[PDB]
Design an enzyme around this catalytic site. Structure first.
Site, PDB file in Angstrom:
ATOM      1  N   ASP A  44       1.023  -1.223  -0.076  1.00 19.53           N
ATOM      2  CA  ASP A  44       0.028   0.099  -0.124  1.00 19.53           C
ATOM      3  C   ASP A  44       0.971   1.275  -0.100  1.00 19.53           C
ATOM      4  O   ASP A  44       1.622   1.444   0.930  1.00 19.53           O
ATOM      5  CB  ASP A  44      -0.827   0.028   1.413  1.00 19.53           C
ATOM      6  CG  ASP A  44      -1.818   1.276   1.240  1.00 19.53           C
ATOM      7  OD1 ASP A  44      -2.758   1.267   0.361  1.00 19.53           O
ATOM      8  OD2 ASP A  44      -1.492   2.393   1.897  1.00 19.53           O
ATOM      9  N   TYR A  49       3.096  10.299   0.356  1.00 23.05           N
ATOM     10  CA  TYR A  49       3.929   9.767   1.438  1.00 23.05           C
ATOM     11  C   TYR A  49       5.465   9.708   1.233  1.00 23.05           C
ATOM     12  O   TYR A  49       6.348   9.617   2.172  1.00 23.05           O
ATOM     13  CB  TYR A  49       3.788   8.017   1.410  1.00 23.05           C
ATOM     14  CG  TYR A  49       2.357   7.605   1.849  1.00 23.05           C
ATOM     15  CD1 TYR A  49       1.498   8.444   2.436  1.00 23.05           C
ATOM     16  CD2 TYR A  49       1.987   6.271   1.856  1.00 23.05           C
ATOM     17  CE1 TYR A  49       0.158   8.009   3.186  1.00 23.05           C
ATOM     18  CE2 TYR A  49       0.675   5.711   2.300  1.00 23.05           C
ATOM     19  CZ  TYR A  49      -0.134   6.750   2.832  1.00 23.05           C
ATOM     20  OH  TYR A  49      -1.660   6.019   3.090  1.00 23.05           O
ATOM     21  N   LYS A  78      -2.557   6.162  -4.492  1.00 21.62           N
ATOM     22  CA  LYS A  78      -3.767   6.918  -4.249  1.00 21.62           C
ATOM     23  C   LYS A  78      -3.443   7.981  -4.739  1.00 21.62           C
ATOM     24  O   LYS A  78      -2.287   8.801  -4.636  1.00 21.62           O
ATOM     25  CB  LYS A  78      -3.930   7.127  -2.621  1.00 21.62           C
ATOM     26  CG  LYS A  78      -3.719   5.830  -1.760  1.00 21.62           C
ATOM     27  CD  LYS A  78      -4.231   5.806  -0.326  1.00 21.62           C
ATOM     28  CE  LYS A  78      -3.809   4.678   0.509  1.00 21.62           C
ATOM     29  NZ  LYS A  78      -2.455   4.651   0.590  1.00 21.62           N
ATOM     30  N   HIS A 111      -7.717   9.319  -2.389  1.00 20.10           N
ATOM     31  CA  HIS A 111      -7.088   9.108  -1.160  1.00 20.10           C
ATOM     32  C   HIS A 111      -7.963   9.645  -0.081  1.00 20.10           C
ATOM     33  O   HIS A 111      -8.209   9.034   1.014  1.00 20.10           O
ATOM     34  CB  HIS A 111      -5.819   9.837  -1.044  1.00 20.10           C
ATOM     35  CG  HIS A 111      -4.751   9.308   0.187  1.00 20.10           C
ATOM     36  ND1 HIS A 111      -3.351   9.555  -0.165  1.00 20.10           N
ATOM     37  CD2 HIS A 111      -5.045   9.002   1.372  1.00 20.10           C
ATOM     38  CE1 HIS A 111      -2.861   8.969   1.088  1.00 20.10           C
ATOM     39  NE2 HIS A 111      -3.796   8.715   1.682  1.00 20.10           N
TER      40      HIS A 111
HETATM   41  N1  LIG Z   1      -5.942   5.752   3.211  1.00 18.75           N
HETATM   42  C1  LIG Z   1      -5.491   6.592   4.088  1.00 18.75           C
HETATM   43  O1  LIG Z   1      -5.769   7.720   4.351  1.00 18.75           O
HETATM   44  C2  LIG Z   1      -4.652   5.804   5.183  1.00 18.75           C
HETATM   45  C3  LIG Z   1      -3.846   4.808   4.763  1.00 18.75           C
HETATM   46  N2  LIG Z   1      -2.943   4.410   5.600  1.00 18.75           N
HETATM   47  C4  LIG Z   1      -2.184   3.031   5.345  1.00 18.75           C
HETATM   48  O2  LIG Z   1      -2.230   2.200   6.282  1.00 18.75           O
HETATM   49  C5  LIG Z   1      -0.832   1.517   6.676  1.00 18.75           C
HETATM   50  C6  LIG Z   1      -1.006   1.164   8.024  1.00 18.75           C
HETATM   51  O3  LIG Z   1      -1.366   2.374   9.170  1.00 18.75           O
HETATM   52  P1  LIG Z   1      -0.310   3.159   9.940  1.00 18.75           P
HETATM   53  O4  LIG Z   1      -1.013   4.349  10.110  1.00 18.75           O
HETATM   54  O5  LIG Z   1       1.188   3.235   9.181  1.00 18.75           O
HETATM   55  O6  LIG Z   1      -0.087   2.398  11.121  1.00 18.75           O
HETATM   56  P2  LIG Z   1      -0.337   0.643  11.776  1.00 18.75           P
HETATM   57  O7  LIG Z   1      -1.328   0.702  12.715  1.00 18.75           O
HETATM   58  O8  LIG Z   1       0.148  -0.315  10.599  1.00 18.75           O
HETATM   59  O9  LIG Z   1       0.966   0.841  12.842  1.00 18.75           O
HETATM   60  C7  LIG Z   1       2.293   1.083  12.310  1.00 18.75           C
HETATM   61  C8  LIG Z   1       3.142   1.148  13.384  1.00 18.75           C
HETATM   62  O10 LIG Z   1       3.225  -0.031  14.267  1.00 18.75           O
HETATM   63  C9  LIG Z   1       4.638  -0.357  14.518  1.00 18.75           C
HETATM   64  N3  LIG Z   1       4.602  -1.914  14.509  1.00 18.75           N
HETATM   65  C10 LIG Z   1       4.297  -2.768  13.420  1.00 18.75           C
HETATM   66  N4  LIG Z   1       4.405  -4.083  13.356  1.00 18.75           N
HETATM   67  C11 LIG Z   1       4.380  -3.983  14.807  1.00 18.75           C
HETATM   68  C12 LIG Z   1       4.664  -5.289  15.632  1.00 18.75           C
HETATM   69  N5  LIG Z   1       4.457  -6.564  15.013  1.00 18.75           N
HETATM   70  N6  LIG Z   1       4.695  -5.267  17.176  1.00 18.75           N
HETATM   71  C13 LIG Z   1       4.867  -3.655  17.421  1.00 18.75           C
HETATM   72  N7  LIG Z   1       4.864  -2.613  16.503  1.00 18.75           N
HETATM   73  C14 LIG Z   1       4.545  -2.974  15.421  1.00 18.75           C
HETATM   74  C15 LIG Z   1       5.502   0.326  13.345  1.00 18.75           C
HETATM   75  O11 LIG Z   1       6.727   0.290  13.834  1.00 18.75           O
HETATM   76  P3  LIG Z   1       8.002  -0.146  13.017  1.00 18.75           P
HETATM   77  O12 LIG Z   1       7.519   0.399  11.452  1.00 18.75           O
HETATM   78  O13 LIG Z   1       9.194   0.660  13.661  1.00 18.75           O
HETATM   79  O14 LIG Z   1       8.415  -1.616  13.088  1.00 18.75           O
HETATM   80  C16 LIG Z   1       4.727   1.523  13.386  1.00 18.75           C
HETATM   81  O15 LIG Z   1       5.071   2.276  14.184  1.00 18.75           O
HETATM   82  C17 LIG Z   1      -0.107   3.134   6.122  1.00 18.75           C
HETATM   83  O16 LIG Z   1       1.344   2.711   6.410  1.00 18.75           O
HETATM   84  C18 LIG Z   1      -0.574   3.381   5.217  1.00 18.75           C
HETATM   85  O17 LIG Z   1       0.085   2.345   4.211  1.00 18.75           O
HETATM   86  C19 LIG Z   1      -2.701   4.714   7.077  1.00 18.75           C
HETATM   87  C20 LIG Z   1      -3.526   5.875   7.210  1.00 18.75           C
HETATM   88  C21 LIG Z   1      -4.420   6.546   6.448  1.00 18.75           C
HETATM   89  O1  LIG Z   2      -3.792  10.700   5.126  1.00 22.76           O
HETATM   90  C1  LIG Z   2      -2.879   9.328   5.169  1.00 22.76           C
HETATM   91  O2  LIG Z   2      -2.698   8.342   4.458  1.00 22.76           O
HETATM   92  C2  LIG Z   2      -1.727   9.205   6.384  1.00 22.76           C
HETATM   93  O3  LIG Z   2      -1.668  10.491   6.790  1.00 22.76           O
HETATM   94  C3  LIG Z   2      -0.997  11.364   6.265  1.00 22.76           C
HETATM   95  C4  LIG Z   2      -0.025  11.097   5.265  1.00 22.76           C
HETATM   96  C5  LIG Z   2       0.976  12.145   5.048  1.00 22.76           C
HETATM   97  F1  LIG Z   2       1.864  11.748   3.851  1.00 22.76           F
HETATM   98  C6  LIG Z   2       0.603  13.269   4.991  1.00 22.76           C
HETATM   99  C7  LIG Z   2      -0.464  13.854   5.518  1.00 22.76           C
HETATM  100  C8  LIG Z   2      -1.225  12.859   6.339  1.00 22.76           C
HETATM  101  C9  LIG Z   2      -2.408  13.117   7.030  1.00 22.76           C
HETATM  102  S1  LIG Z   2      -2.376  14.650   7.908  1.00 22.76           S
HETATM  103  N1  LIG Z   2      -3.641  12.532   6.997  1.00 22.76           N
HETATM  104  C10 LIG Z   2      -4.728  12.895   7.518  1.00 22.76           C
HETATM  105  C11 LIG Z   2      -5.803  13.625   6.725  1.00 22.76           C
HETATM  106  C12 LIG Z   2      -5.379  14.093   5.533  1.00 22.76           C
HETATM  107  C13 LIG Z   2      -6.466  14.732   4.501  1.00 22.76           C
HETATM  108  C14 LIG Z   2      -7.752  14.847   5.056  1.00 22.76           C
HETATM  109 BR1  LIG Z   2      -9.114  15.650   4.115  1.00 22.76          BR
HETATM  110  C15 LIG Z   2      -7.959  14.345   6.360  1.00 22.76           C
HETATM  111  C16 LIG Z   2      -7.091  13.863   7.138  1.00 22.76           C
HETATM  112  F2  LIG Z   2      -7.380  13.216   8.324  1.00 22.76           F
END
Ligand SMILES: NC(=O)C1=CN([C@@H]2O[C@H](COP(=O)(O)OP(=O)(O)OC[C@H]3O[C@@H](n4cnc5c(N)ncnc54)[C@H](OP(=O)(O)O)[C@@H]3O)[C@@H](O)[C@H]2O)C=CC1
Ligand SMILES: O=C(O)COc1cc(F)ccc1C(=S)NCc1ccc(Br)cc1F
Length: 313
Positions: A44, A49, A78, A111
């Protein structure tokens, strides 16, 4: 459990993928290489990012090494909010393709539902800190996504952070050509999303759960916030199954027919998080995990809350 879920475009999507938000650019190439070596076949990604070039280096190396074939990978990215106009979508997609070393994406998502003013800044602000909207609407952005399918740039299109009414808006679009294949939303035991999930599933839209571990590395984390990975109650379920708390948190959405995308740059954890196909949570475990809901969100953003299309309340 079977590794893939069938999408409404006829393709199969791996139910476990590697997240890449916050993966440092100097670490993410190795993270993705390790992930592919230990079995991951879904990554993903997102332009916002700022690490797609480095993700792409890993993908390309593993394809060149013939560790995997391209058809076996499922690469998701995205469209960022500053690219919702008609004349910007294709170039945004192509920049992502060029960075990821890909000729096509398996899935390309809107996104966030909100369009922002185009320009260099990912979050253009007015002098009082409010995001500057674009007068783009969801439906015309969707039409632009549909064109990408019809140009061969993406195999599937979907949405992310769309609420129930916004998904409905997409499904009721006049002249809709392709339904969204996926809605990627935050989901974990503190934000269980039962209502939105049943709506999407009832409509044949696969839901991907992001931040399944509660995003402990989110940049806005505060010490007072609940912590899934440290929750005594979740640790007890993990102990009972002789698994880690993270493994429970990953298996949980899988058993809800969700895709899940935990992020790590730690090689040992990348492997740990994949070892989730050899145990089952009971129905009682599942209901118990669901009971922890508190409507708590990692991803929200104050600067965007007045945008007409901001999804959350
Ligand atoms: N569509 C959207 O708006 C969004 C999409 N996403 C996607 O979802 C993905 C996952 O969500 P994200 O917010 O990154 O967070 P996660 O819930 O996946 O948590 C990531 C964190 O958990 C830690 N971690 C991972 N595996 C373990 C484990 N086995 N034990 C303990 N700690 C662990 C990592 O540490 P470390 O890396 O140091 O090992 C990191 O600090 C994102 O990376 C992105 O690809 C996320 C937010 C928004
Ligand atoms: O967004 C991600 O995947 C992970 O998070 C992020 C990842 C980035 F690389 C940069 C900003 C964000 C933020 S601050 N995201 C939250 C966010 C952004 C836009 C709107 Br509309 C609402 C909202 F809640």
């Amino acid at each position: 459990m079977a590794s893939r879920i069938l999408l409404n475009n006829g393709a199969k999507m791996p139910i476990l993928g590697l997240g890449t938000w916050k993966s440092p650019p100097g670490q993410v190439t190795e993270a993705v290489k390790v992930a592919i070596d230990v079995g991951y076949r879904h990554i993903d990604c997102a332009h916002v990012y700022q690490n797609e070039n480095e993700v792409g280096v890993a993908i390309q190396e593993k394809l060149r090494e013939q560790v995997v074939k391209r058809e076996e990978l499922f690469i998701v990215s995205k469209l960022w909010c500053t690219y919702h106009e008609k004349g910007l979508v294709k170039g945004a997609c192509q920049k992502t393709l060029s960075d990821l070393k890909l000729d096509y994406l398996d899935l390309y998502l809107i996104h966030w539902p909100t369009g922002f003013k185009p320009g260099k800044e990912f979050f253009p602000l007015d002098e009082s800190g409010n995001v500057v909207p674009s007068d783009t609407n969801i439906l015309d952005t969707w039409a632009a996504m549909e064109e990408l399918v019809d140009e061969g740039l993406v195999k599937a299109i979907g949405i992310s952070n769309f609420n129930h009414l916004q998904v409905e808006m997409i499904l009721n679009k006049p002249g809709l050509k392709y339904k969204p294949a996926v809605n990627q939303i935050e989901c974990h035991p503190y934000l269980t999303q039962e209502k939105l999930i049943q709506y999407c599933q009832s409509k044949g839209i696969v839901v991907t759960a992001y931040s399944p571990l509660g995003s402990p590395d989110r940049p806005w984390a505060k010490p007072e916030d609940p912590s899934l990975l440290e929750d005594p109650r979740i640790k007890a379920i993990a102990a009972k199954h002789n698994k880690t708390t993270a493994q429970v948190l990953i298996r949980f959405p899988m058993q809800r027919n969700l895709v899940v995308i935990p992020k790590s740059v730690t090689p040992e954890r990348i492997a740990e998080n994949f070892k989730v196909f050899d145990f089952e949570l009971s129905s009682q475990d599942m209901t118990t995990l669901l009971s922890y809901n508190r409507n708590w969100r990692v991803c929200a953003l104050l600067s965007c809350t007045s945008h007409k299309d901001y999804p959350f309340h």
